[PDB]
Amino acid sequence: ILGGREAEAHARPYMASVQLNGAHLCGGVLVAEQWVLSAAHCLEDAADGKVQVLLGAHSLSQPEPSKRLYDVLRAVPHPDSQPDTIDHDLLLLQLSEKATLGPAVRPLPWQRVDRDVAPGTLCDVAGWGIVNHAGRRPDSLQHVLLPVLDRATCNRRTHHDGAITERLMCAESNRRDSCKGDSGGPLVCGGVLEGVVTSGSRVCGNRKKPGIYTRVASYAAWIDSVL
Numbered sequence: 374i375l376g377g378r379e380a381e382a383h384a385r386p387y388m389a390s391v392q393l394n395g396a397h398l399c400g401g402v403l404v405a406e407q408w409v410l411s412a413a414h415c416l417e418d419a420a421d422g423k424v425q426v427l428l429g430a431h432s433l434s435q436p437e438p439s440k441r442l443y444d445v446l447r448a449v450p451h452p453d454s455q456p457d458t459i460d461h462d463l464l465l466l467q468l469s470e471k472a473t474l475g476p477a478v479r480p481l482p483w484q485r486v487d488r489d490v491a492p493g494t495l496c497d498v499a500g501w502g503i504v505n506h507a508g509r510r511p512d513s514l515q516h517v518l519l520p521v522l523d524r525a526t527c528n529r530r531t532h533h534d535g536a537i538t539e540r541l542m543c544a545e546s547n548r549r550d551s552c553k554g555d556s557g558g559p560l561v562c563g564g565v566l567e568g569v570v571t572s573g574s575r576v577c578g579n580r581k582k583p584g585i586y587t588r589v590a591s592y593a594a595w596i597d598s599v600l
């Protein structure tokens with residue numbers, strides 16, 4: 374996250390770190406007792422590396438009572454995702470067992486009503502992705518509050534030039550923005566999951582290239598079918 378701040382530890386108990394060979398790779402969101410939602414492009418090329426999900430965490434390196442690494446039984450990329458497109462960029466990870474729930478580990482309710490948010494709704498995005506142009510990686514969870522950007526502005530020739538489908542939404546990216554390492558993580562509006570970060574626009578913090586987030590409500594049947 375460019376332009377953000379240290380999140381309050383454990384205040385986002387749905388927050389997951391998707392790990393490959395023991396390093397943070399992408400964000401994710403605990404959406405059911407045994408399921409984490411993330412981005413398909415995270416695992417596009419993961420081959421036979423070891424995929425794990427860290428729940429209950431603030432710090433990636435320090436021990437914490439609620440922090441537990443889970444193994445993954447199955448990774449379920451959206452069947453219509455492709456490397457090299459921005460569309461359908463969702464991935465469901467089935468944990469090897471149901472997660473132990475508590476104050477620091479809880480699934481987030483997610484949006485099932487397929488209608489847009491009001492423009493300018495302030496939504497929260499969190500992640501362990503890079504935090505400056507040099508590529509610094511934070512040990513602990515960062516977040517930013519971002520206003521939703523209306524799809525027509527987002528689709529301007531100056532902006533993403535028609536690529537924002539009904540299945541996607543935008544948030545402003547003026548210096549505050551999701552970046553590498555934050556894909557898969559949650560965009561939360563009104564206490565409900567609304568979007569999942571995607572890298573479709575790979576640049577970071579350029580206000581003319583808004584953040585793109587995949588709309589969970591648009592994929593409700595798919596999420597239910599996989600659960």
Ligand SMILES: NCc1cccc(Nc2nc(N[C@H]3CCCC[C@H]3C(=O)O)nc3ccccc23)c1
Nearest residue numbers: 414415550551552553554555556571572575577
């Ligand atoms: N603000 C939009 C946004 C949101 C999320 C990620 C990015 N940027 C970038 N993303 C990624 N990578 C994506 C896609 C592949 C899976 C890993 C992802 C991730 O780490 O988030 N690879 C990169 C390589 C060089 C420069 C920038 C970026 C940008």
